[PDB]
Amino acid sequence: DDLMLALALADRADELTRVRFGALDLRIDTKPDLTPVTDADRAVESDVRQTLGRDRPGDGVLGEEFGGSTTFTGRQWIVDPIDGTKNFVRGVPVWASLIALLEDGVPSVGVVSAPALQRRWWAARGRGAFASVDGARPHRLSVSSVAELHSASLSFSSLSGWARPGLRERFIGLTDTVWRVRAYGDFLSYCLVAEGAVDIAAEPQVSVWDLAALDIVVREAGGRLTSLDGVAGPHGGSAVATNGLLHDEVLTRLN
Amino acid sequence: DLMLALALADRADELTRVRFGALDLRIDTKPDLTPVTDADRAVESDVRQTRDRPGDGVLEEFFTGRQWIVDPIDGTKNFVRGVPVWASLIALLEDGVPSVGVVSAPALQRRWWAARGRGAFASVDGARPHRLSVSSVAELHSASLSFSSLSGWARPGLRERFIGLTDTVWRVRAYGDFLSYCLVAEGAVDIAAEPQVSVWDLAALDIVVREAGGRLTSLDGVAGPHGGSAVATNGLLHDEVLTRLN
Numbered sequence: 001d002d003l004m005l006a007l008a009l010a011d012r013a014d015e016l017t018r019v020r021f022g023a024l025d026l027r028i029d030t031k032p033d034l035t036p037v038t039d040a041d042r043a044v045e046s047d048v049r050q051t052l053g054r055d056r057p058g059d060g061v062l063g064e065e066f067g068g069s070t071t072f073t074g075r076q077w078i079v080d081p082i083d084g085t086k087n088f089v090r091g092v093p094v095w096a097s098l099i100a101l102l103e104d105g106v107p108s109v110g111v112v113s114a115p116a117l118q119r120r121w122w123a124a125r126g127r128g129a130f131a132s133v134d135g136a137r138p139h140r141l142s143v144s145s146v147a148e149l150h151s152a153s154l155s156f157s158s159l160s161g162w163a164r165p166g167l168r169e170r171f172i173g174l175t176d177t178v179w180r181v182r183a184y185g186d187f188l189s190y191c192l193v194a195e196g197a198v199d200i201a202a203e204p205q206v207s208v209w210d211l212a213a214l215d216i217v218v219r220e221a222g223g224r225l226t227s228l229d230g231v232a233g234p235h236g237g238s239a240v241a242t243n244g245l246l247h248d249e250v251l252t253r254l255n
Numbered sequence: 256d257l258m259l260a261l262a263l264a265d266r267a268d269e270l271t272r273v274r275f276g277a278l279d280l281r282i283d284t285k286p287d288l289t290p291v292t293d294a295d296r297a298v299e300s301d302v303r304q305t306r307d308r309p310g311d312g313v314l315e316e317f318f319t320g321r322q323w324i325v326d327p328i329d330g331t332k333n334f335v336r337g338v339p340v341w342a343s344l345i346a347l348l349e350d351g352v353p354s355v356g357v358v359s360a361p362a363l364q365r366r367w368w369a370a371r372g373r374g375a376f377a378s379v380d381g382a383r384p385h386r387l388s389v390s391s392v393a394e395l396h397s398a399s400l401s402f403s404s405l406s407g408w409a410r411p412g413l414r415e416r417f418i419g420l421t422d423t424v425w426r427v428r429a430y431g432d433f434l435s436y437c438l439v440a441e442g443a444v445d446i447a448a449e450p451q452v453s454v455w456d457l458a459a460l461d462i463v464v465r466e467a468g469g470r471l472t473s474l475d476g477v478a479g480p481h482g483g484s485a486v487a488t489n490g491l492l493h494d495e496v497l498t499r500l501n
């Protein structure tokens with residue numbers, strides 16, 4: 001089945017990314033040469049496309065690095081080989097491959113694979129969400145039971161993205177009200193929500209390649225993921241993930 | 256002295272790993288800090304007990320000559336929620352100047368250490384140690400910054416200034432607590448800053464940052480761990496960072 005293949009693709013991407021991460025010349029003195037990450041990002045995409053072309057010939061593929069059909073029909077794989085390239089290039093291990101199958105534009109299978117954090121998160125529709133640490137036996141994920149905002153832990157990415165001068169004030173406001181604030185960034189915030197270690201994750205601009213695997217993992221863990229406008233799923237352009245209980249309050253404070 | 260510190264961390268790692276694993280992670284309100292206070296006390300007691308170096312003093316749970324300073328669990332608010340960003344900080348101070356430091360985060364499978372004049376190192380999953388050096392980033396507009404949370408920056412003007420700083424740098428995260436500083440020492444980040452931080456929380460970090468070639472000061476530019484706040488950088492960026500915050 002489809003989950004088994006997605007997990008296999010992540011195993012393969014992990015081999016490709018691990019070696020390249022290790023190979024990086026980490027000496028730096030200005031904004032980093034994104035070049036070797038673009039190389040690695042392209043290499044892993046090409047390899048996933050080649051495997052997909054063989055082993056599920058029918059299904060479409062959309063790639064962040066190379067491209068795919070712009071519309072969203074039938075079975076379609078969506079792949080971001082390295083989410084967190086800006087960490088990758090600095091030697092910061094917060095980066096992952098995101099591999100997701102969409103059925104008529106609805107995420108049905110998700111894998112987030114972060115070999116340099118020795119972690120994987122995955123989910124298939126109606127089958128639950130899971131995580132492994134250092135390849136050890138998988139644990140079923142569930143969101144937290146935190147019902148009050150004043151008791152909630154939030155993780156974000158960076159303050160700059162919250163562009164609108166009012167939305168920034170509103171978001172800064174939200175950080176003042178919650179119990180705990182960090183910014184683990186990118187995919188990590190959302191996986192932590194799914195794990196129930198964090199209660200809220202928010203990003204003001206985020207693409208479908210970056211959200212697709214997360215949407216299914218969050219949901220199968222019991223959580224909710226929507227745009228800032230409350231539209232469910234990965235196509236919103238922004239994402240707020242919560243344990244569900246907190247969702248409407250979070251969205252209300254942000255609007 | 257260094258060998259002893261690394262040994263104390265090995266022992267603290269055994270105590271902390273088991274207790275982190277043992278935690279009941281179901282939660283619906285602010286977390287019961289109780290099991291972390293228990294673990295914190297347990298590790299401190301066991302370090303106090305560990306004996307060899309009987310002459311030396313010991314100072315978070317329970318500044319003359321040889322004094323050990325120990326925070327057994329930095330990042331207790333992570334520990335209690337199941338977030339693996341937490342560590343033991345073990346440091347030796349000589350007349351109030353850090354000479355030996357170990358940061359051990361077994362849940363991240365990482366350790367960072369330094370002794371005066373001997374350099375700074377890190378291990379990942381017990382694999383062969385690497386010598387650390389800070390980055391060579393000279394321009395603020397190209398710098399990566401990591402902090403803790405925004406609320407700590409209390410003063411309405413200092414907050415605006417800090418928010419400003421985040422707007423100007425190339426990359427902003429908040430990995431939090433000890434992690435930000437260790438990343439500076441690794442050269443993976445160029446600036447780390449916290450507006451309220453205790454000597455127990457900075458002592459191991461001061462030596463690690465400096466042996467890696469960086470600088471660590473208060474927000475008022477007082478060098479070392481006693482300043483009540485900390486800014487660590489690769490050195491090159493230090494004065495510009497302090498100036499923008501003052």
Ligand SMILES: N[C@H](COP(=O)(O)O)Cc1c[nH]cn1
Nearest residue numbers: 082083084085086186187210
């Ligand atoms: N920093 C990201 C650019 O690189 P990448 O897509 O190759 O990781 C943008 C991003 C993705 N998720 C969160 N932010």
Ligand SMILES: N[C@H](CO)Cc1c[nH]c[nH+]1
Nearest residue numbers: 093094117184339340363
């Ligand atoms: N924050 C991650 C939580 O799994 C671990 C980490 C961050 N940086 C390095 N390691």
Ligand SMILES: [Zn+2]
Nearest residue numbers: 041080082083
């Ligand atoms: Zn990418």
Ligand SMILES: [Zn+2]
Nearest residue numbers: 080082083210
């Ligand atoms: Zn991406």
Ligand SMILES: [Zn+2]
Nearest residue numbers: 326329330456
């Ligand atoms: Zn502390």
Ligand SMILES: [Zn+2]
Nearest residue numbers: 329330432456
């Ligand atoms: Zn701390």
